[PDB]
Every structure is written in C-alpha cells, then in structure tokens.
Amino acid sequence: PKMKTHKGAKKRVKITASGKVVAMKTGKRHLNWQKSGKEIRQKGRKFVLAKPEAERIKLLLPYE
C-alpha cells in the first residue's frame, strides 16, 4: 500500500526549494550557562544536512 510519511522527520526537518534538507543545529537544548554567546547564537541557526543523510531523510517524506 502507499508509503507513510515519517512524522519524526516531518517534525524536525524541511526540504528546501532546490531539494536540500535543512535542520536546526544541535547542542543548545540545555547546559548552556558556560557556553559563550558565540556558541548559543550560532547554534540558533539552520544548517544543511550532508548529502548522504539528506538522501535518506527525503525518501521518508514522499509527499512533501
């Protein structure tokens, strides 16, 4: 039967207009007091997943 959308992927990740997979940087959910303002600021941005991992995630989103 028809493939199901993986909802863990759908909730964490976005496929961009050209087919990149963009996610939120990790590492700032907690334990942030002794992290420089540089670490916190930069971890607040989106990044582009490396191609091998992006190809896997995209197959999980067959209808995006």
* Torsion (CA) 49, 54, 63, 12 in degrees, nearest 10: -40
Q: How far is the CB of 28 from another protein (least distance, A)?
A: 12
CA max distance for the chain: 51
Q: Note whether 13 binds RNA by CB under 7 A.
A: no
Q: How far is the CB of 21 from RNA (least distance, A)?
A: 9
Contact with Mg ion (CB under 5 A): which of 5, 8, 48, 53? 8
- The single residue among 18, 36, 45, 50 that binds Mg ion, judged by CB under 5 A, is 36
Helix (H, G, I), strand (E, B) or coil at 46: strand
